[PDB]
Amino acid sequence: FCGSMMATGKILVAYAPPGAQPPTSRKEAMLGTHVIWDLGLQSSCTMVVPWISNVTYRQT
Amino acid sequence: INYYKDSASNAALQLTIGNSTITNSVVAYGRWPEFIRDDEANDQPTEPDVATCRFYTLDTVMWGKESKGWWWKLPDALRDMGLFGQNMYYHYLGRSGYTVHVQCNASKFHQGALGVFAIPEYCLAGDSDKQRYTSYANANPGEKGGKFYSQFNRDTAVTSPKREFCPVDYLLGCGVLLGNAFVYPHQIINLRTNNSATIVLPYVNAMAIDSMVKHNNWGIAILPLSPLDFAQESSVEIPITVTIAPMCSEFNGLRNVTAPKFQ
Amino acid sequence: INYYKDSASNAALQLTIGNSTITNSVVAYGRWPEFIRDDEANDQPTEPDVATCRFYTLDTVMWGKESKGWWWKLPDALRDMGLFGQNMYYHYLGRSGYTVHVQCNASKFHQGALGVFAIPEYCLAGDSDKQRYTSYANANPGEKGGKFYSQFNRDTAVTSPKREFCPVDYLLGCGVLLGNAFVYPHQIINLRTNNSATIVLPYVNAMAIDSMVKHNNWGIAILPLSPLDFAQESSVEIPITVTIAPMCSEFNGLRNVTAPKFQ
16 A cells, blocks of 8 residues: 555455355455455555465466 | 351453454453363364354444434344354354454544444333334344434334334443443444444453343444534535454354244 | 386275165175275265164155166255255265165066166266257256156257157167176166165265255166066056165365256
8 A cells, every 4th residue: 555644445355266156345355355454553464365275286 | 167068058453253354452351262172062073274264244334413323233144144144053153253344534634533343232222102112123123233312212003013123322222321331341432533443352241151042142323423524514424334253263063054033 | 126116117684764664685796885084085074873874764666567777866856855965065075885775566467577777977968969968957866756768859950949758678778788787886676585675875976075956876777677467458657766864974075055947
């Protein structure tokens, strides 16, 4: 986040495994693997997407 | 010396739960949620671990100068949240603790204070001369919740009574002064110091396990202790968000699904 | 002596489950259902114990003189059975074994024989010149299942093709003689000796865990090996019932619910 020091806010970053409709609202997204980020306290956020797959390897 | 046989006759930071993560906490009555022990029961319970013990976010509300307060009921507010609601409606008996997180962010030039209170067996007053005439649908709003009022507006309808609550802010909606509400587990959000609140609620009831549909175990009340203001602007509005995570949930009595009639 | 580094270059009674009870069994490939082991995985799985591992009964069917057979697909047939379906649609990856119980009762003066076959990766043939043109909806009938036919009826529609299967009884619906179908796990119900059949199916697939919505792991086929008869009556009909119990079910990949379009 590259805003001013006086700016504040909160964000939600979500990952959804395949199979269902792609999320279009916060209510649907929150059901997946989500992280809440506070801009004021931290200017950077990190989210780790873990490996979950039926096959051992995925095509590129 | 006791003569009678019967005794009665005797003279007298980041928190991660499941696949959810949020980035000091208050524990109600100093008791962490726990599962039922072998020395207290009444079949094989169903105890979901991660499919139900996770953070669910409710609808955001708006706080302004004329806002008087909001209230929610648990486990009513989570009746339509993923598999938790399905297990609630597919079982006769349920049990669970909760973790409540209230979020509200502002700037250094704003001012205000919010009081959050967790109340066991939170019973509200009606809006009519008839006593205990409130309907089930009106007493279980859901995730939208209700709002407080500054005066008692008696219902004048005689043909089609509303049958709704009429909470009063300074009486806490139950006939008790708000100043003493701090006797309950509580948190204060002051915009000049902090921007969030956290509470942990264990399972409290006269019985080890009880139905979740016809009985609500907890109530959450949020009220503005000080009015919101910003610089010298006439109108100010900021969002308030609530997130709730079930903890150590048990279910028993599997059978066909319950379908309550909400209007 | 091997010269190249790579190896490839090297030259060559009552059964009770959950809250359900039914009053000899056949184990497919001599392998009982089991959970995934620590030495094979790809997050925290969700493993319901009693809320999903129980007997569900499908719709009863009728067997007469002109009946040719029936077929079902698993886990497709259980997509709308209690919390099992909810977990199936709320998770990206699923795994489970099955216990299948077929019930059919008659008198000592009846005669007939039913063959029940469990087939892994049971693929059926189409009903049109186009290849692999069957639709998802037609390939997943649900708990109602499908039926076999004694002849191949090519679809003549050119504007609105049906896109449906056309199984043939004596070809097992896949181009193989029925007589060899006994190579698969199977049971025979002969009315003069027994009245029920039981099979136990472990999880079989090229992967440890796979999606349940877009892939069906098992197929169940019931065919009359001998025609039904009773005394000298012209018409005879008796009911056939099927019950299925999931066993050792695991789910992973929690997210919003899937809503397939079935017509």
